[PDB]
Amino acid sequence: VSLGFLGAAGSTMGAASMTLTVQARNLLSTHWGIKQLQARVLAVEHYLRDQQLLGIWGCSGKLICCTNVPWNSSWSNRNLSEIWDNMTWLQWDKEISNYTQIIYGLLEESQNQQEKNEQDLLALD
Amino acid sequence: SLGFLGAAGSTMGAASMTLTVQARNLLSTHWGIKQLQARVLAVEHYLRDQQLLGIWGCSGKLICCTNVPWNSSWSNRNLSEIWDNMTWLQWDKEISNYTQIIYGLLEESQNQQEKNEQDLLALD
Amino acid sequence: SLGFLGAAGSTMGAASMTLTVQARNLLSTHWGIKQLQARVLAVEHYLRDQQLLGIWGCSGKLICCTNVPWNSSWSNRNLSEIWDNMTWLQWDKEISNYTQIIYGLLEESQNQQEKNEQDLLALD
Amino acid sequence: NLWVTVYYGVPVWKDAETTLFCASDHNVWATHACVPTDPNPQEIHLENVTEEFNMWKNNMVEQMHEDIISLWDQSLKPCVKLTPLCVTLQCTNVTNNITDDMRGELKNCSFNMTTELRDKKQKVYSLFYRLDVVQINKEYRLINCNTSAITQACPKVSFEPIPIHYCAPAGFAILKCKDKKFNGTGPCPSVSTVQCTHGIKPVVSTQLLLNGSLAEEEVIIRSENITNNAKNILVQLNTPVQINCTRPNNNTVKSIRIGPGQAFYYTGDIIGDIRQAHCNVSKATWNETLGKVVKQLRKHFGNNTIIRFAQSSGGDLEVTTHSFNCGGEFFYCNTSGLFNSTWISNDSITLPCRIKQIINMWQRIGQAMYAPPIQGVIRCVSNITGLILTRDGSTTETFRPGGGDMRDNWRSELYKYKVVKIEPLGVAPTRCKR
Amino acid sequence: NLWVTVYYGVPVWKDAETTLFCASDAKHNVWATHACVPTDPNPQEIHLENVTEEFNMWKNNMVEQMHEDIISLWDQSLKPCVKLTPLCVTLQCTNVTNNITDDMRGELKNCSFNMTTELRDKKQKVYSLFYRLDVVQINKEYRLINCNTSAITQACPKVSFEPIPIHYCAPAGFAILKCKDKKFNGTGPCPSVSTVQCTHGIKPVVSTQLLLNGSLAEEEVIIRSENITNNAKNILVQLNTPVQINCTRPNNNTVKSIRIGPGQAFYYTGDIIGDIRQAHCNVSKATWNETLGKVVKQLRKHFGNNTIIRFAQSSGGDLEVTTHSFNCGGEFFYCNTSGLFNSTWISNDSITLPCRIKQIINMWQRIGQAMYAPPIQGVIRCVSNITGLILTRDGGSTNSTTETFRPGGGDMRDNWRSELYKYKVVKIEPLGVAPTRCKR
Amino acid sequence: NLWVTVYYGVPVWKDAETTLFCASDHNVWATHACVPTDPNPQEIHLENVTEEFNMWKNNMVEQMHEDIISLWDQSLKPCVKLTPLCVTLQCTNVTNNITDDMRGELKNCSFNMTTELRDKKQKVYSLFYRLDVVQINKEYRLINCNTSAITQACPKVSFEPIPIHYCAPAGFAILKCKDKKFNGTGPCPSVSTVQCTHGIKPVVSTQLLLNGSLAEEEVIIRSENITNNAKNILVQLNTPVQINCTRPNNNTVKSIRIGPGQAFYYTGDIIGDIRQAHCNVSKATWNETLGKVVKQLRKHFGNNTIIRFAQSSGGDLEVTTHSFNCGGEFFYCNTSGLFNSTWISSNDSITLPCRIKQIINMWQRIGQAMYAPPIQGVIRCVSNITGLILTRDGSTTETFRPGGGDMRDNWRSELYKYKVVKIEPLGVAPTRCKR
Ligand SMILES: *[C@@H]1O[C@H](CO)[C@@H](O[C@@H]2O[C@H](CO)[C@@H](O[C@@H]3O[C@H](CO[C@H]4O[C@H](CO)[C@@H](O)[C@H](O)[C@@H]4O)[C@@H](O)[C@H](O[C@H]4O[C@H](CO)[C@@H](O)[C@H](O)[C@@H]4O)[C@@H]3O)[C@H](O)[C@H]2NC(C)=O)[C@H](O)[C@H]1NC(C)=O
Ligand SMILES: *[C@@H]1O[C@H](CO)[C@@H](O[C@@H]2O[C@H](CO)[C@@H](O[C@@H]3O[C@H](CO[C@H]4O[C@H](CO)[C@@H](O)[C@H](O)[C@@H]4O)[C@@H](O)[C@H](O[C@H]4O[C@H](CO)[C@@H](O)[C@H](O)[C@@H]4O)[C@@H]3O)[C@H](O)[C@H]2NC(C)=O)[C@H](O)[C@H]1NC(C)=O
Ligand SMILES: *[C@@H]1O[C@H](CO)[C@@H](O[C@@H]2O[C@H](CO)[C@@H](O)[C@H](O)[C@H]2NC(C)=O)[C@H](O)[C@H]1NC(C)=O
Ligand SMILES: *[C@@H]1O[C@H](CO)[C@@H](O[C@@H]2O[C@H](CO)[C@@H](O)[C@H](O)[C@H]2NC(C)=O)[C@H](O)[C@H]1NC(C)=O
Numbered sequence A: 001v002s003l004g005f006l007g008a009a010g011s012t013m014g015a016a017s018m019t020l021t022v023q024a025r026n027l028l029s030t031h032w033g034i035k036q037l038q039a040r041v042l043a044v045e046h047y048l049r050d051q052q053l054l055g056i057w058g059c060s061g062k063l064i065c066c067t068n069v070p071w072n073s074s075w076s077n078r079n080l081s082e083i084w085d086n087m088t089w090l091q092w093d094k095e096i097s098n099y100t101q102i103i104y105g106l107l108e109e110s111q112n113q114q115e116k117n118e119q120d121l122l123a124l125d
Numbered sequence B, C: 001s002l003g004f005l006g007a008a009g010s011t012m013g014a015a016s017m018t019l020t021v022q023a024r025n026l027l028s029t030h031w032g033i034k035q036l037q038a039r040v041l042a043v044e045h046y047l048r049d050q051q052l053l054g055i056w057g058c059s060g061k062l063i064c065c066t067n068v069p070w071n072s073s074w075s076n077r078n079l080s081e082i083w084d085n086m087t088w089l090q091w092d093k094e095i096s097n098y099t100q101i102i103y104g105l106l107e108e109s110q111n112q113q114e115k116n117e118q119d120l121l122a123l124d
Numbered sequence D: 001n002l003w004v005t006v007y008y009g010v011p012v013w014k015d016a017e018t019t020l021f022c023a024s025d026h027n028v029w030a031t032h033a034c035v036p037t038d039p040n041p042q043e044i045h046l047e048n049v050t051e052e053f054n055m056w057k058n059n060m061v062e063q064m065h066e067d068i069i070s071l072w073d074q075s076l077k078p079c080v081k082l083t084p085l086c087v088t089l090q091c092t093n094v095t096n097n098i099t100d101d102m103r104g105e106l107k108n109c110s111f112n113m114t115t116e117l118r119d120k121k122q123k124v125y126s127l128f129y130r131l132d133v134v135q136i137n138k139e140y141r142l143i144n145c146n147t148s149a150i151t152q153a154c155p156k157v158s159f160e161p162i163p164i165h166y167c168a169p170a171g172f173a174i175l176k177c178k179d180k181k182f183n184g185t186g187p188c189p190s191v192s193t194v195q196c197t198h199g200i201k202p203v204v205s206t207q208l209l210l211n212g213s214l215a216e217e218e219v220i221i222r223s224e225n226i227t228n229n230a231k232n233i234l235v236q237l238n239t240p241v242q243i244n245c246t247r248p249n250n251n252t253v254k255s256i257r258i259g260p261g262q263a264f265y266y267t268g269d270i271i272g273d274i275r276q277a278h279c280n281v282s283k284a285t286w287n288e289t290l291g292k293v294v295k296q297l298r299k300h301f302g303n304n305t306i307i308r309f310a311q312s313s314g315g316d317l318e319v320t321t322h323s324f325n326c327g328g329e330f331f332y333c334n335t336s337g338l339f340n341s342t343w344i345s346n347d348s349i350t351l352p353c354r355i356k357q358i359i360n361m362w363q364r365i366g367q368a369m370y371a372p373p374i375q376g377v378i379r380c381v382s383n384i385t386g387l388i389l390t391r392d393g394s395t396t397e398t399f400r401p402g403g404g405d406m407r408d409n410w411r412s413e414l415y416k417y418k419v420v421k422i423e424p425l426g427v428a429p430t431r432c433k434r
Numbered sequence E: 001n002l003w004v005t006v007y008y009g010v011p012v013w014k015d016a017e018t019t020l021f022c023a024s025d026a027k028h029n030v031w032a033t034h035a036c037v038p039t040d041p042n043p044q045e046i047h048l049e050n051v052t053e054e055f056n057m058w059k060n061n062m063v064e065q066m067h068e069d070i071i072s073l074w075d076q077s078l079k080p081c082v083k084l085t086p087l088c089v090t091l092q093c094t095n096v097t098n099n100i101t102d103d104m105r106g107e108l109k110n111c112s113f114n115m116t117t118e119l120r121d122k123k124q125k126v127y128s129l130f131y132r133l134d135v136v137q138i139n140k141e142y143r144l145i146n147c148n149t150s151a152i153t154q155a156c157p158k159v160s161f162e163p164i165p166i167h168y169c170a171p172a173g174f175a176i177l178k179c180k181d182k183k184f185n186g187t188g189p190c191p192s193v194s195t196v197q198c199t200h201g202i203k204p205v206v207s208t209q210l211l212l213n214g215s216l217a218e219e220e221v222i223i224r225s226e227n228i229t230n231n232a233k234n235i236l237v238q239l240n241t242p243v244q245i246n247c248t249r250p251n252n253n254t255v256k257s258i259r260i261g262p263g264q265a266f267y268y269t270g271d272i273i274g275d276i277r278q279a280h281c282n283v284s285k286a287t288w289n290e291t292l293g294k295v296v297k298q299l300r301k302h303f304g305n306n307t308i309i310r311f312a313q314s315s316g317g318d319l320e321v322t323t324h325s326f327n328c329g330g331e332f333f334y335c336n337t338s339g340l341f342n343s344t345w346i347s348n349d350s351i352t353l354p355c356r357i358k359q360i361i362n363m364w365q366r367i368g369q370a371m372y373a374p375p376i377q378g379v380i381r382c383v384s385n386i387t388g389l390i391l392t393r394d395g396g397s398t399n400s401t402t403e404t405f406r407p408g409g410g411d412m413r414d415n416w417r418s419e420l421y422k423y424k425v426v427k428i429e430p431l432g433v434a435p436t437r438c439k440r
Numbered sequence F: 001n002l003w004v005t006v007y008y009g010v011p012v013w014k015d016a017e018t019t020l021f022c023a024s025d026h027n028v029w030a031t032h033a034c035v036p037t038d039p040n041p042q043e044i045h046l047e048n049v050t051e052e053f054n055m056w057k058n059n060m061v062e063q064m065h066e067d068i069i070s071l072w073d074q075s076l077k078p079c080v081k082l083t084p085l086c087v088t089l090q091c092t093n094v095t096n097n098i099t100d101d102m103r104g105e106l107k108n109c110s111f112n113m114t115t116e117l118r119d120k121k122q123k124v125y126s127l128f129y130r131l132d133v134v135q136i137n138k139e140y141r142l143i144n145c146n147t148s149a150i151t152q153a154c155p156k157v158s159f160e161p162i163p164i165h166y167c168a169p170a171g172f173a174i175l176k177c178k179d180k181k182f183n184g185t186g187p188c189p190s191v192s193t194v195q196c197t198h199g200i201k202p203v204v205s206t207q208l209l210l211n212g213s214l215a216e217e218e219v220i221i222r223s224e225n226i227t228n229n230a231k232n233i234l235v236q237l238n239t240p241v242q243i244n245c246t247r248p249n250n251n252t253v254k255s256i257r258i259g260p261g262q263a264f265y266y267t268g269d270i271i272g273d274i275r276q277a278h279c280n281v282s283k284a285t286w287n288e289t290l291g292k293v294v295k296q297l298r299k300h301f302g303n304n305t306i307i308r309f310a311q312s313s314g315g316d317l318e319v320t321t322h323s324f325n326c327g328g329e330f331f332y333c334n335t336s337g338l339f340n341s342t343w344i345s346s347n348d349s350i351t352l353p354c355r356i357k358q359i360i361n362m363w364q365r366i367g368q369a370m371y372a373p374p375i376q377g378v379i380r381c382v383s384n385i386t387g388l389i390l391t392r393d394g395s396t397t398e399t400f401r402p403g404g405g406d407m408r409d410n411w412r413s414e415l416y417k418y419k420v421v422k423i424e425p426l427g428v429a430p431t432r433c434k435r
């Protein structure tokens, strides 16, 4: 059966991939309503920032999105099976937290170039 | 055309030709609070529907074709009755009890498809 | 390597390479109301534009070619004049009156395409 | 065989409760706080749609009620508080020119009022109506002294109703019933969609409904349950009855300072003779109108029954008389000149009216308002567009004026509107597969 | 040679500070719960296997948020109540001597004063009783104690001060991590955790010295502190069994009221039927002695096996701080706890704690927002459970080998820390990357 | 043969009116309701663009005006009300050690005021300036007791004009004109984009502008319409004029409890001689400064036109004198000594006498008033005059007089170079590309 929201936390990275949906569908879900209003607004802003970034990278509607940027051993040098079968996502995030911005920048560059190349091919036939 | 909800009550098959009309109109001291509450409400509803469509594998589409088979127990009517005689209002009532079943199946189908895509890309 | 509006004044062609920079900078004691209003508006404007790209079938893209032909009555300038000489501010002024027309055509084209996709998939 | 297809932008809806906002075109109604509407708002007829309405469960009424009360209080928040006025008053009768109907109705009172300097007091003389004072044990006090705070309404802010348009938020729509001769409690075969309602004037009255919409063809009689003696009956007329109201006295208004930045207004004197306020209703118009009501009312009570009208039962003037705001002044008119019959050439009915300066609007305790007097002579003309009747419970039924629950006035203008939520995402089978 | 893969819906989080909202659980109560959002009675709790989370109850901002919300709810309740400014007059007072017993001597006074009526030009003579604690002699001339600080607002007679559980719920995008370890001492990693959306209805109980009506430890007394060897820090002790305490104000109070302006009713004690006796609380001796023995054993684990432990009284600097303050029946009690903390531990029969009653209350350590507590008609009896203790350590650098503990208390955030100790708020960070063998 | 292509993120903007929020970085302006900005804000120069600015048609001005008034009221809202001071005052002159220049002006008043208990009254002696007190028919009242209630400013809150930065909401940007010698009404060839403005000090003054931005090269003379005698002329200087303002009298401040939770502050007495408040400027600097103004002013009026300065016309003290805050005290200085000369083709000074007033009706509102507590001891402040507000008299030898009039023009000066625009990321253009 389902483990619930964050139920997979602590499970291995390759196991937790089966719970991406449950953790995605749970996003966006006298007087003194101002606190409630401020909370509702913030939840929306965070949601949209993640969606905007995925859109920039070309990952419009997918929970799993592959990108043409190669992985650098300088960011993390581990076996493919260590990463997916032994480590969890909390650990992984700590191991590569110092490369977050460079990876994101590279992803944006790749998609931008790809859009230009697609436009040129459409023009040529 | 007829304008917003102008097709309500018309045959389902005809009504479906003008989905853009509704798609455009959606998201179109304390008094200020009442307006803020209203604006937030419109946004939240809009986003929840888009979130859900994304989960099912469609984004930016008014007509989302998927791979979940239709169960004769949800409705045993034929296509000519559904599309030529029934309206959308009648239909929604007719299958109201199966909404969550269908939604659950749609999420599962996309989950499997994404995994399959990842494997094929890695495979070749 | 220019900044947020640093591309302004460059030719239309040159500026096409900075779209990421402009796009990523969108959305980023009773003066709490003024803050909420600012927050909310940034979101509403953002969503209206995304909604429109969605309707036109350009969701998720900074550059989207479509199937609406260009009418010389909107502009009869040379392709090189438009791209290698004029800037985007100038272009926007030159075709300001045709904006609504073009947007309507874009929505109609996409709606027709979606219907056609549905029929083709059903046919196999 | 068949597969699920998902459609977005599907033209369907569900009953819903959401918050509506104000729209419109220096007033008690806070118009400046409303957004302007478009000229000629778009109305869409829904062909082949039958909806179901129930006006008695309509929550638009509740919002109108709450918003109006809030605006009322907001208007008074920044105005002068007449707490220094709750003092022993020394009063005698005004006897200069009496019609013998006004005998004992108007009093001449004297009191010791505070002023600009904390060290000084004033001898102030003013006129009050009997209904605003009580005896203490010639020693009188104002009626609000043992129950409420008293706030003077701001002298420059008008009470005249301004049409207010209620608008649904995006994602919602307002359906309206155009079906003629529709009572509001069942299926409606003729429906259209709007984003904003017509402007509704927030007219406040207690027995007759003034300045509302009129029935399109015939008098319409509606209630939650016609056989229930505990319910009010709302009657919509298809013709207006014109009523001419006046307070025919030339009032000289005086003003004093009761502290820094404060001002208190009172009637200094009356020029000419002193006579009673009253309203005129033509006899012919009234008798035809009432006859139409009886005919339609028999539809529910029998083809051979007897219908009697009578004046209302006792209670506070708020419910026993017909009250209204005429040019800023507050009238309490006795309707017994009307509703006195049994059914089986410029003549008119004069309804005597009383005036009050201190009121407690919206059936509340603790919030009193002082309506400042108005300089000069007041006259206004209004349209009676409906009635609030109750019935008792043989061969004869008796109907009486009733009312006081303000939501029932609102229910009239809002009887044809419903708020629904748009539910654009739906599913249906077809032959398509990815 | 692997390409970067983007995943959304990843089960990770980071510590964060956000805004929380209340859930009432479905007429008048001081906590204004009608402003809260009703929740399901049985929120689902998700157990996290193989997850260890670092906790620190002393740096938990949820505590600060309750403190602020509680203060604000309190003020919203008083904002619309009777102003009572006109009561700050010179009073003519004598002692109530007619039927009191020895202990109650000189603790209750009979005052007369000239107060206003509805009409601005009229006055009335009013007689009322006041407790000694609220009346201060000037220069038979007295004034109320609040006159030289601020105006006093009368609490509304219809609004209850009884606590209603307030569950705190995280906003969308956030989650609350709950520590379940038995014997969790407030800090460090917690190997058994779970996720909830709302906390378990913490009650806004207000007290000093002793903690009332809280949760219990599952098996042993738990000692929690920021730094146990730092004598400047407080020690919070959670009990594994309740101690029943029965408090009363055994006098038949006849309540009277007058109008002091339009509306503006003022409430006061008119008189007392029968003889006068002091307020008090009953704690069983056997229960209390067992409870301390459990506490002493746990303290020795930190201060040394064969270390001598002595319990003593607090300093006399502040009436609220040095006594056990609570609001039984709507009255405010100030009980002397010395009978509970007078013992040296070296390895039907009950304790009676005398209590005083005060009506002018100045709480939350603020200055100038005094409240007048209306008297309560009849006789008051409350039964409460002691579910924890506050202690401070007082000693020097000398290795005397004996440690002394005193009740301490007085900082309201400690009551909140005691119950919120197991919760942490984190932000969900669903977006992230990892390498694999997939390329577009 | 071209197709419509849609682009998003296009660097296009349109003029717009939106709501800005404050950032900045106790005191009235020192409040914790703004969101502190970066120590390193960025600015992006826009090459090959020109944009039109119009400082007159600019709603940033209106927002500062509204925000400042609102903040002002929030500060005073929770402070002690002084209604009890409207009792009748018994007053005589303070002539103890009075210079002739101050004869009269300062009065010794006494009155019956309430105390902590409702039952008791107390007698108080206090000193007042003539400008705050009017005659009843030896009996006087405070000037505001017939028109408005008065609130005491909180003694713990200083009127310090702490710089406040304004920031655009996301989706908007602020364009800034970097073109030197820009008048503020036409095209600006050198423009840059910022997210936030420089911090602006919300300085209150009536004739001369104090502690604002200084012009880079030449005196800049600007107005909505030079030809219109109904418009003000704003003059921005290249060098500051140093002005030294003082209140030489040593005031001793006393306070009284007037009710529970309330205390009133007042001047008890003066230690030492009673002398007139005053401001000094260097005579040489002032003569140079006007010469620079005249030289540029002639560009609009002719080289055959005489420019003659004159003192302003009468009216309420606020607009006939130069008013400012100075240590928290409110000064009203006579500038007639600065605008006496007619201009036709060292170690000396100009002394401006000043008056002090404690009852303030700021922003020209009626119904509100503030009581300024006196400040203990001798007060001095030194400030930089960076500009002037002048008006035309309205067929030879034009006359200019001081006037500030509407305070909106104070804000205009700092904001003359900023414009708010909305970013519009979508657009289309033809290209040879089909799906
Ligand atoms: C049902 O609906 C009817 C309308 O169909 C309402 O009747 C209107 O009621 C309003 C409010 O009382 C009337 O407005 C007033 O009209 C006066 C007319 O004066 C004229 O003549 C004088 C010269 O003697 C001229 O100076 C003046 O300009 C006019 O040409 C005005 O004098 C009144 O002004 C006073 O009040 C305003 C308040 O904003 C102040 O600003 C003014 O300074 C002044 O003190 C006022 O404008 C309106 O005329 C009536 N219409 C008709 C056709 O009669 C009914 O009241 C409504 N029924 C109910 C119960 O609400
Ligand atoms: C144009 O710009 C100039 C330059 O900024 C402004 O001039 C300043 O004006 C302010 C306000 O009048 C002056 O600030 C005050 O200075 C007093 C003296 O400080 C000296 O002595 C203390 C001794 O402890 C030293 O710490 C300090 O560094 C100085 O050497 C202070 O006593 C004042 O304090 C006030 O607040 C405290 C709060 O705790 C109270 O206890 C005090 O009693 C008092 O109320 C205050 O700090 C500042 O010194 C001036 N600068 C200069 C260089 O002279 C102009 O005012 C401005 N013009 C306009 C129109 O805005
Ligand atoms: C917590 O860790 C344990 C291992 O210590 C996990 O148990 C293993 O799960 C895999 C996958 O189902 C099995 O093949 C192994 O045989 C299990 N090992 C043991 C010793 O039982 C457990 O699944 C983890 N929990 C979560 C939520 O991931
Ligand atoms: C208003 O019209 C409705 C619709 O015809 C009437 O509703 C019917 O009332 C009877 C009782 O008298 C019920 O038995 C029917 O089932 C109701 N029908 C429907 C469709 O709801 C209603 O009585 C009319 N009311 C008035 C005052 O005229």
Ligand SMILES: *[C@@H]1O[C@H](CO)[C@@H](O[C@@H]2O[C@H](CO)[C@@H](O)[C@H](O)[C@H]2NC(C)=O)[C@H](O)[C@H]1NC(C)=O
Pocket (backbone or CB within 6 Å): D244, D245, D246, D279, D280, D348, D350, D379
């Ligand atoms: C209402 O009707 C009455 C009729 O009773 C009118 O009263 C007459 O008014 C005229 C002047 O308008 C007088 O000359 C007559 O003497 C009045 N008759 C009586 C019986 O006194 C009254 O004017 C009408 N009022 C309005 C404005 O409707």
Ligand SMILES: *[C@@H]1O[C@H](CO)[C@@H](O[C@@H]2O[C@H](CO)[C@@H](O)[C@H](O)[C@H]2NC(C)=O)[C@H](O)[C@H]1NC(C)=O
Pocket (backbone or CB within 6 Å): E094, E095, E097, E105, E106, E107
């Ligand atoms: C009112 O009570 C006070 C105590 O609060 C009485 O004062 C005390 O009187 C006893 C003698 O009976 C002395 O031993 C104490 O030292 C006094 N206490 C103080 C603080 O001085 C007072 O006498 C009582 N008044 C009346 C009229 O009975």
Ligand SMILES: *[C@@H]1O[C@H](CO)[C@@H](O[C@@H]2O[C@H](CO)[C@@H](O)[C@H](O)[C@H]2NC(C)=O)[C@H](O)[C@H]1NC(C)=O
Pocket (backbone or CB within 6 Å): E185, E186, E187, E188, E189, E223, E224, E225, E228
């Ligand atoms: C509460 O439990 C924590 C966790 O075991 C204790 O923290 C340890 O304290 C020792 C002594 O200072 C250090 O050497 C360890 O490194 C600490 N561990 C961690 C995870 O921080 C803490 O001292 C206990 N406190 C009390 C009052 O019992």
Ligand SMILES: *[C@@H]1O[C@H](CO)[C@@H](O)[C@H](O)[C@H]1NC(C)=O
Pocket (backbone or CB within 6 Å): A079, A080, A081, A082
């Ligand atoms: C996996 O990593 C370990 C070290 O942690 C290494 O010894 C082993 O050889 C690696 N195996 C693979 C997959 O090459």
Ligand SMILES: *[C@@H]1O[C@H](CO)[C@@H](O)[C@H](O)[C@H]1NC(C)=O
Pocket (backbone or CB within 6 Å): B007, B009, B010, B011, D047, D048
């Ligand atoms: C209503 O029904 C008729 C058939 O009776 C049909 O011709 C008409 O098009 C329908 N209206 C709509 C809007 O579909």
Ligand SMILES: *[C@@H]1O[C@H](CO)[C@@H](O)[C@H](O)[C@H]1NC(C)=O
Pocket (backbone or CB within 6 Å): C006, C007, C008, C009, C010, C011, C014, F047, F048
């Ligand atoms: C401005 O024009 C020059 C022309 O030589 C060009 O080199 C420069 O790149 C242009 N600036 C921008 C931002 O395009």
Ligand SMILES: *[C@@H]1O[C@H](CO)[C@@H](O)[C@H](O)[C@H]1NC(C)=O
Pocket (backbone or CB within 6 Å): E090, E091, E092, E112, E113, E114, E125
């Ligand atoms: C009430 O006022 C009178 C005034 O003569 C005074 O004598 C009396 O003592 C006052 N009474 C009280 C109880 O304060």
Ligand SMILES: *[C@@H]1O[C@H](CO)[C@@H](O)[C@H](O)[C@H]1NC(C)=O
Pocket (backbone or CB within 6 Å): F096, F097, F272
């Ligand atoms: C007036 O000044 C003299 C010094 O010339 C001083 O001794 C005296 O005390 C002062 N008197 C007053 C009333 O200020």
Ligand SMILES: *[C@@H]1O[C@H](CO)[C@@H](O)[C@H](O)[C@H]1NC(C)=O
Pocket (backbone or CB within 6 Å): F092, F093, F103, F104, F105
């Ligand atoms: C106060 O000074 C004025 C100056 O004009 C003078 O007329 C007045 O008589 C003086 N009053 C006293 C009491 O000296």
Ligand SMILES: *[C@@H]1O[C@H](CO)[C@@H](O)[C@H](O)[C@H]1NC(C)=O
Pocket (backbone or CB within 6 Å): F088, F090, F110, F111, F112, F123
């Ligand atoms: C205070 O009140 C008394 C009342 O007898 C009066 O004589 C005196 O003049 C007043 N004092 C002042 C300063 O107004």
